[PDB]
């Protein structure tokens, strides 16, 4: 049922090539959330910093000969993830996340749509206890995520389980010569 | 100055449209529910905004986002007659980001299709369209065809209804069901 | 024969789709995950952004022992995480996210049918 | 594809700058936006439903709730008829999901506003 799905989690990973650009994106996201219309608090996500990656290309220093003179060209990347949980204002959250991006920063979005299945069967009022014949005769903190901590725990456990499954599948299916199976006509 | 004034008028018109034709329960919930009134209201609001969107002189990009239009107009004016030196030309972006009105408009952009289109495809909805005007057009065409017969009659009306059309008959060359979906926006 | 119905066409033809967004064809708890890429103007499409998957708990599915064993055997140990009793199904067979999602739904429905066959 | 993406793009396929084309673009970018086919057909359907209001009421009296549930298009027809006229053609009240009371009454005249500055 499309009408029943709920946006359980939306994790936006900003990928930037500049610390200034990443800081600008973070500040823009904060400002966008600070002006969100509806106890009630802005949909503050849970920040999650990601490490820094690098790459190198090595070249000589000379146009001819002199192999012992070498130069290194180093590149950098930065990643920072913010997670919204139990997102009701989907439009507002997405608009803020996409408009926060500054400079050359890109973003990768991670959506989770959850369906609760068949609703639990309602139990009516339990029968009341009566004396017998014998008796007759005788959110609050600013900047913190407003969603439920148990909800966050369940979402995180599901995320970790799916990450383990993805890693296992990728590692099993990885190949250097894709398409080759042992003993098949090579 | 005239372009900036037009951008402000457009933002005011968008606010007035939002207050005049609000989407109850949120845009995402309205889209998922797919109620005729919600689709009609969203399409009306979108078409009014499209009609009211101005055509500026100093920009050749007709931005549909009032935030983008206003920010670009402000940036052009700042570059033209507000930059003393390279430091100012670099701080223009910080100046734009420090405006409270732009901060407010930052969280009022339209919902991109991919937020829900993959979910609808996974669910298996083929009579759907993320575009509100397209959904309204489909619903209204179906209603017109049903009315054409509304004048053994309920059976004929149901036969003419879109939902009761075999999937095999959509194209002769693919006599198999569940082969055609909804066009992405 | 020289002309045959391909497996994906068979899956589409035998798949049952809901009549309206108010009808659910799964009936069990689950979470659907997909990735989308946004950023400044770009000429090259971001790779590895077309796959989607569905994760659910066998306990939540609430099947008999034979059906649970059949589900685990069909999905293999790679798609089953024992620490939290979770199971995940992936689909990255096409370069389009919508096509991958439709294929994922069809295969999930077929998997549930096969499990019920247990 | 990967091997055919090494060198620079052709430098002889870059667009030229022509005053005639610049003027043509300047003239064309101010072109008007017509009303949408969806809204025109909505007006036509509203007129048809108002004309055949009696047939709609008869059909909804003959039909049951389960048929409406199984045919969503009939839900759209019911919503259109309800916004056109306040009468409740169905014998039994409908569930909120199939139809939620909008509180709206009708289109080119309803969708209008004026102001100056």
């Amino acid at each position: 049922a499309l009408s029943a799905y709920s946006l359980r989690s939306l994790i936006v990973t900003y990928n930037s090539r500049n610390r200034s650009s990443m800081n600008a994106t973070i500040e823009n996201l904060k400002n966008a959330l600070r002006w969100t219309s509806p106890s009630w608090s802005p949909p503050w996500p849970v920040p999650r910093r990601i490490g820094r990656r690098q790459w190198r290309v090595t070249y000589l220093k000379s146009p001819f000969k002199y192999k012992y003179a070498l130069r290194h060209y180093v590149f950098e990347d930065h990643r920072y993830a913010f997670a919204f949980y139990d997102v009701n204002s989907v439009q507002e959250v997405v608009s803020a996340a996409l408009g926060a991006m500054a400079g050359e920063t890109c973003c990768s979005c991670r959506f989770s749509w959850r369906f609760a299945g068949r609703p639990p069967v309602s139990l009516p009022t339990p029968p009341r206890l009566v004396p017998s014949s014998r008796a007759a005769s005788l959110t609050v903190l600013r900047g913190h995520c407003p969603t439920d901590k148990e909800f966050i725990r369940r979402a995180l456990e599901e995320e970790q389980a799916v990450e383990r499954i993805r890693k296992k599948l990728d590692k099993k299916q990885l190949q250097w010569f894709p398409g080759k199976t042992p003993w098949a006509p090579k | 100055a005239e372009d900036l004034h037009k951008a402000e008028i457009y933002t005011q018109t968008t606010e007035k449209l939002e207050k005049q034709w609000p989407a109850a329960g949120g845009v995402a919930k309205g889209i998922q529910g797919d109620q005729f009134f919600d689709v009609m209201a969203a399409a009306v609001r979108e078409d009014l905004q499209d009609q009211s969107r101005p055509v500026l002189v100093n920009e050749l990009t007709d931005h549909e986002n009032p935030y983008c239009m206003k920010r670009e107009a402000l940036r052009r004016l700042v570059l033209h007659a507000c930059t003393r030196n390279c430091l100012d030309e670099t701080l223009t972006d910080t100046l734009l980001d420090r405006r409270a009105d732009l901060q407010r408009l930052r969280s009022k952009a339209r919902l991109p299709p991919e937020v829900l289109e993959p979910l609808a495809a996974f669910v298996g909805i083929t009579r759907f369209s993320f575009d509100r005007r397209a959904r309204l057009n489909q619903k209204v065409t179906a209603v017109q065809h049903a009315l054409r017969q509304i004048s053994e009659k309920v059976e004929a009306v149901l036969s003419v209804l879109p939902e009761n059309f075999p999937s095999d008959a959509l194209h002769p060359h693919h006599p198999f069901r569940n082969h055609f979906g909804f066009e992405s926006s | 024969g020289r002309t045959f119905v391909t497996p994906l066409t068979k899956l589409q033809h035998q798949a049952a789709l809901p009549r309206s967004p108010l009808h659910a064809r799964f009936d069990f708890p689950h979470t659907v995950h997909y990735d989308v890429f946004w950023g400044p103007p770009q000429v090259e499409e971001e790779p590895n952004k077309s796959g989607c998957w569905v994760s659910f708990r066998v306990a939540d599915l609430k099947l008999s022992d034979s059906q649970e064993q059949r589900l685990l055997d069909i999905l293999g140990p790679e798609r089953y995480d024992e620490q939290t009793g979770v199971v995940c199904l992936e689909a990255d067979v096409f370069p389009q996210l919508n096509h991958n999602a439709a294929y994922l739904g069809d295969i999930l429905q077929q998997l549930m049918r096969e499990v019920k066959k247990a | 594809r990967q091997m055919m993406k090494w060198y620079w793009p052709s430098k002889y396929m870059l667009q030229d700058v022509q005053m005639a084309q610049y003027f043509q673009m300047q003239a064309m970018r101010f072109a008007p936006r017509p009303a949408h086919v969806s809204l025109t057909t909505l007006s036509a359907t509203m007129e048809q439903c108002w004309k055949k209001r009696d047939a709609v009421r008869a059909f909804f009296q003959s039909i049951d709730e389960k048929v409406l549930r199984e045919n969503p298009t009939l839900q759209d027809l019911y919503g259109l008829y309800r916004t056109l006229c306040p009468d409740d053609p169905l014998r039994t009240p409908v569930d909120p999901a199939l139809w939620r009371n909008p509180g709206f009454t009708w289109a080119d005249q309803r969708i209008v506003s004026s102001s100056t500055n």
């Binding site: 049922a1 068949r118 | 309920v154 009761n164 069901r177 | 119905v5 033809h13 035998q14 009808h23 | 199984e70």
Partner: peptide, 27 residues
């Protein structure tokens, strides 16, 4: 709270066209 997990067979039995739509033609 309007999820309809099971389609009503009575409506499809009553109406033939919906019956055909729900029917799966043979491979």
């Amino acid at each position: 709270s309007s999820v309809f997990f099971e389609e009503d067979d009575s409506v499809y039995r009553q109406f033939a066209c919906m019956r055909r739509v729900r029917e799966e033609p043979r491979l």
